[PDB]
């Protein structure tokens, strides 16, 4: 019982050991620490304090180090004796990993058990060059309409996803998560993805309400999860991102895909703020350092979609942004904006006025995130982005002209918006959603009017699979729709509109 | 089951102090010279193999 | 003993130099013997070489450079126990409310570490309270935190009295309201209102614990009341089971205090004025409340923003913490309908389907519903006039002005000037009266007569009496 | 080192039960005996009722 | 059983809309319900009255 699992402890430790180097401690204190001696480290070395805390050489300077504490103040004390780990700062990389709580030192902090792994890799690495490099082909399933195919996500791309802070900001990304657990199961490798999910600045009771909703969800053993939360110290939140990217990489040059999400990069920002400032490193624009571009770029390009040689390997990334009031004049979110490509904003206004999710389509955008999508998911929502930006110039001016075609628009403009939502926490199949997209495309949402929306859905749904289930079947596997397919779904989707 | 939980809270603090006792027995005993002898001949034998 | 003389007093910055293999650590306190007190210094930094920097407790006026120092060895030990329940204290853990000495039992540190990860909230564990207004349309929770918006003198302290009765009944706790930056005038009307309606006594065993930081003490006893009061709570839920409901004061006076600290301390001011260290601090002390697997702090803040910013760095991060805002205001009051929580601007981030029940979720809904078309119906009927209803359009108008009288409940507290018994009303019978109202069984009810009610039951007698 | 001597010793010579039960008592819930009010719900008892009702209503009229 | 009661419930409403004098059968039948779902949700409140010892 009691006695046991402290002889096994105290057993378990000896802490007896011949040393290399020591210091000791010059003047410690503000989440950096001065160290006397230390003459043989190298640069971003691990170093042990006597404390138990361990810290990452930042300045090596000559006849004193500056090191960066990871931990709280608190236990550092003046004249203890430091001593150096022997290693450069690394994160424990391996599949026993997946489902194990961590936080961003690789600690097991309440853990499934103690933390087994493959190999370690540097905390800080640097990205594959330019040669190693391939468009993506694949695409990301959300399982959410309005990202579907209407805002395109692939495999391998850093698409980013804006808004005001929680507007329900995390479920979006969840759902990414879940929806793929039928494909994360296959026979098919390169579809599996491995999800890490980073939670940085977030309270530690949050956390601990996402592990288990996860577990009533059965998806976190295929994903791990990072902490770095509020509570916890701003140089461990720094490093948060980059720790865990490591642990990402591992699947990915396994060549096999994977996933991250950053939750919130703004966050990663300020915690590097507060160790830059007490550094004595002037403010720049936005009083945030001038050297935060630094870590969002080294940061974001060590996911990409890799070529043929490294096994076609991808890690892909959904960045989570704390907009200060749906602002684009501010520093931090247009630096996360112009190294990425695509956008998923959402609004706040819209959250609150019963779209779930509230993913306005007007900002949102996809550059070479477009070439995600397989055919059937190009013919379905076939210029449906090109028609709801119509939709915003009709009803600009219905505060001129007023006319049959401009109010048609508009109609079939209310009506395809109320048909993008979806149930969230239970993402709705990809399959499911291909006929949807096809009828609100095809103009058949001029028979139902709004009320109506979600009736129509699942009767629609249960019709088609009890009357035809080739259609779908052709949809599981094919995954192109052909001319023949498309007019056998139009037939029946019209006789479904009248009756 | 609750009170029952506790009284394992309750043990590992009990059964700390106890440790804490004995660490002020051995260091009032002239085990604190007994042993230093013994950590002397360990590093004797450490530092002579670097 | 490690002990050092004076050699500086930069502000209220004191640096006290120490001998040699006598070293202090980080957050210990020092006390400086004087015959004028004593005065708390807390060690928030290391020069080195034997040099400490420190922030005070009490004013630094009148201090010579070579009065004697002595380090306890780690942070203020401040009373705990049900002695320390119905007293107010300042930071240093003795009585300013000089009711002789407060009788110590078990002291403990005002600095502890985070709870761990698998005793935070796995789950929303829903707080009871005998407020409806409050159940249906922000649940309360033993996890949340649920920040009070409104002026100041407007039923705002009336409503944080209320609250402690409730949880009384509910549970059997007890709380602690903590006020930061406390204006001297006004904490003797609430401690003498406090004693009075009975949450304070004199007479023996009390709920609310007072812990006060006057203005004219410098800023670091301002910030570290907070950590004080919280620690009284976390020794009644790990090692008595039971829930404390913990009130703060102003938490615009919370990020105030910190920038002063980072200032004198030689630290550079962050965005927008304020302190480097605005949201690790507050993390630390969120992440202290929480529901442990024995018991529960919960914490009801009061919000007040920069001059009218939700732009600025310090609600936003505030912000995070909280799951729910309760949000009073005057244009309710004018009604005289208290509770003076805005019924649309209520909103709680743990009112779901999948929380509160699906039922209560879809009552709570479309009674907000109700009074938000109502609201925006009669934007239009004033400027056209009022004969343009129809059958339907007033039956929004009827429905919800039926509610809206029914808000008001009377306070226990606040029982003579409303002349009627407080009730209290729990969460299951809550849903229970609105459904009545949604299949109209209340929609004929007379309109003057839902004026101070309680539960489904209660209002049929107030009814019979303003027809009979 | 000194640990584990001193573990061994002061394990062995100082070994800790589980506490009384007049301990657990006074700390626990006192548990709770037989939940019986006896009698069951009375309604409507002897015909004293049944003539008041018989006498007092008749309402088929306009 | 809980059948019978509903169906003269709406037996007696169609009755009342014609003669005078079920205008007040009606007020027994809300009276007899009122009771009478009293049960049922005694009756859902009601689960197994055992007290675990297996593992607690």
Same mark, same amino acid.
């Given at each position: 019982e009691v006695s046991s699992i402290l002889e096994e402890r105290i057993k378990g430790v000896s802490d007896e050991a011949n040393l290399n180097e020591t210091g000791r401690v010059l003047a410690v204190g503000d989440g950096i620490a001065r160290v006397f001696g230390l003459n043989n480290i190298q640069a971003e070395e691990l170093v042990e304090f006597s404390s138990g805390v361990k810290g990452m050489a930042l300045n090596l300077e000559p006849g004193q180090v500056g090191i960066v504490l990871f931990g709280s103040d608190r236990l550092v004390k003046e004249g203890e004796l430091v001593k150096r780990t022997g290693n450069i700062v690394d994160v424990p990389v391996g599949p026993g990993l997946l489902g194990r709580v961590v936080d961003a030192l690789g600690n097991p902090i309440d853990g499934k058990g103690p933390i087994d792994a493959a190999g370690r890799s540097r905390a800080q690495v640097k990205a594959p060059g330019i040669l190693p490099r391939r468009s993506v082909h694949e695409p990301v399933q959300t399982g959410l309409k309005a990202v579907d195919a209407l805002v395109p996500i692939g495999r391998g791309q850093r698409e980013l996803i804006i808004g005001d802070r929680q507007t329900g900001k995390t479920a979006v990304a969840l759902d990414t998560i879940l929806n793929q657990k039928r494909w994360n199961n296959g026979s098919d490798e390169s579809k599996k993805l491995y999800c890490v999910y980073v939670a940085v600045g977030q309270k530690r009771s949050t956390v601990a309400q996402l592990v288990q909703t996860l577990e009533q969800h059965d998806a976190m053993k295929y994903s791990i999860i990072v902490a770095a939360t509020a509570s916890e110290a701003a140089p461990l939140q720094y490093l948060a991102p980059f720790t865990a990217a490591s642990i990402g990489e591992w699947f990915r040059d396994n060549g096999k895909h994977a996933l991250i999400v950053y939750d919130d990069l703004s966050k990663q920002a300020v915690a590097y703020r507060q160790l830059s400032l007490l550094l004595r490193r002037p403010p720049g624009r936005e009083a945030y350092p001038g050297d935060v571009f630094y870590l969002h770029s080294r940061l974001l390009e060590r996911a990409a979609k890799l070529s043929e040689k490294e096994g076609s390997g991808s890690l892909t990334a959904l960045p989570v942004i704390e907009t200060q009031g749906g602002?684009?004049?501010?520093?931090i979110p247009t630096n996360v904006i112009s190294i990425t490509d695509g956008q998923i904003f959402l609004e706040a206004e819209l959250f609150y006025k019963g779209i779930r999710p509230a993913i306005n389509v007007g900002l949102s955008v996809s550059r070479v995130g477009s070439a995600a999508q397989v055919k059937a998911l190009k013919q379905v929502a076939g210029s449906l982005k090109l028609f709801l930006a119509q939709y915003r110039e009709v009803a600009a001016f219905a505060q001129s002209d007023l006319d049959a075609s401009t109010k048609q628009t508009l109609v079939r403009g209310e009506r395809l918006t109320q048909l993008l939502k979806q149930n969230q926490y239970s993402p709705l199949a990809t399959e499911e959603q291909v006929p949807l997209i096809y009828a609100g495309v095809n103009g058949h949402?001029?028979?139902?009017?709004?009320?109506?929306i979600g009736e129509f859905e699942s009767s629609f749904l249960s019709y088609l699979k009890s009357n035809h289930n080739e259609l779908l079947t052709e949809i599981r596997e094919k995954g192109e729709l052909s001319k023949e397919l498309l007019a056998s779904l139009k037939s029946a989707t019209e006789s479904f509109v009248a009756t | 089951v609750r009170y029952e939980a506790s009284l394992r809270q309750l043990e590992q603090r009990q059964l700390a102090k106890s440790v804490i006792s004995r660490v002020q027995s051995e260091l009032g005993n002239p085990k604190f010279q007994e042993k230093v002898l013994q950590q002397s001949i360990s590093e004797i034998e450490q530092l002579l193999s670097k | 003993p490690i002990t050092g003389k004076v050699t500086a007093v930069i502000g209220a910055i004191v640096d006290v130099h120490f001998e040699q293999s006598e070293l202090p650590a980080i957050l210990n306190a020092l006390e400086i013997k004087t015959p004028q007190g004593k005065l708390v210094l807390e060690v928030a930094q290391h020069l080195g070489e034997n040099t400490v920097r420190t922030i005070a407790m !009490?004013?630094? &006026?009148? *201090? #010579?450079?070579g009065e004697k120092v002595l380090d306890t060895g780690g942070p203020i030990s401040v009373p705990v126990g049900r002695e320390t329940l119905g007293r107010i204290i300042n930071v240093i853990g003795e009585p300013i409310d000089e009711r002789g000495p407060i009788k110590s039992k078990l002291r403990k540190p005002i600095h502890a570490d985070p709870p761990s990860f698998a005793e935070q909230s796995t789950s929303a564990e829903i707080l009871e309270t005998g407020i409806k207004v409050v159940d249906l349309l922000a649940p309360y929770a033993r996890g949340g935190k649920i920040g009070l918006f409104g002026g100041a003198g407007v039923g705002k302290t009336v409503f944080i009295q209320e609250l402690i009765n409730n949880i009384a009944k509910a549970h059997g706790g007890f709380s602690v309201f903590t006020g930061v930056g406390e204006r001297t005038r006004e904490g003797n009307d609430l401690y003498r209102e406090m004693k009075e309606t009975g949450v304070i006594n004199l007479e023996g065993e009390s709920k609310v614990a007072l812990v006060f930081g006057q203005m004219n003490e410098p800023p670091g006893a301002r910030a570290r009341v907070a950590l004080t009061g919280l620690t009284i709570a976390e020794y009644f839920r790990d090692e008595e089971g039971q829930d404390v409901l913990l009130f703060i004061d102003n938490i615009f006076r919370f990020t105030q205090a910190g920038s002063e600290v980072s200032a004198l301390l030689g630290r550079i001011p962050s965005a927008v004025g304020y302190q480097p260290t605005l949201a690790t601090d507050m993390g630390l002390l969120q992440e202290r409340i929480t529901t442990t697997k024995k018991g529960s702090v919960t914490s009801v803040q009061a919000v007040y923003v920069p001059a009218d910013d939700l732009t600025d760095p310090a609600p936003a991060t505030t912000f995070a913490h909280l799951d729910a805002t309760t949000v009073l205001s005057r244009g309710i009051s &004018? *009604?005289?309908?208290?509770?003076? #929580? !805005?019924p649309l601007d209520s909103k709680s981030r743990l009112l779901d389907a999948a929380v509160v029940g699906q039922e209560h979720y879809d009552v709570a809904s479309k009674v907000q519903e109700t009074l938000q078309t109502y609201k925006s119906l009669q934007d239009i009927i004033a400027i056209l006039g009022m004969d343009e209803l129809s059958e339907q359009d007033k039956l929004t108008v009827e429905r919800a002005r039926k509610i809206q009288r029914f808000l008001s409940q009377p306070f226990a507290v606040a029982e003579v000037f409303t002349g009627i018994p407080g009730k209290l009303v729990r969460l299951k019978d809550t849903v229970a009266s609105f459904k009545a109202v949604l299949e109209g069984k209340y929609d004929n009810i007379p309109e003057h007569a839902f004026y101070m009610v309680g539960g489904i039951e209660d209002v049929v007698a107030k009814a019979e009496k303003l027809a009979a | 080192n000194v640990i584990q001597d001193l573990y061994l010793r002061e394990l062995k010579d100082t070994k800790l039960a589980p506490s009384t039960l007049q301990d657990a008592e006074g700390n626990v819930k006192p548990w709770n005996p037989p939940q019986k009010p006896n009698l069951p719900e009375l309604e409507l008892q002897g015909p004293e009722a049944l003539k008041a009702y018989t006498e007092q209503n008749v309402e088929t009229a306009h | 059983a809980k059948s019978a009661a509903n169906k003269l419930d709406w037996a007696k409403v169609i009755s009342s809309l014609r003669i005078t004098g079920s205008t007040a059968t009606q007020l027994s039948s809300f009276k007899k319900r009122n009771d009478e779902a009293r049960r049922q949700l005694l009756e859902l409140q009601s689960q197994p009255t055992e007290v675990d010892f297996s593992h607690y």
């Open positions: 602002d684009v004049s501010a520093y949402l001029d028979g139902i009017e709004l009320s109506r | - | !009490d004013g630094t &006026e009148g *201090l #010579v450079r &004018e *009604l005289g309908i208290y509770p003076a #929580v !805005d | - | -």
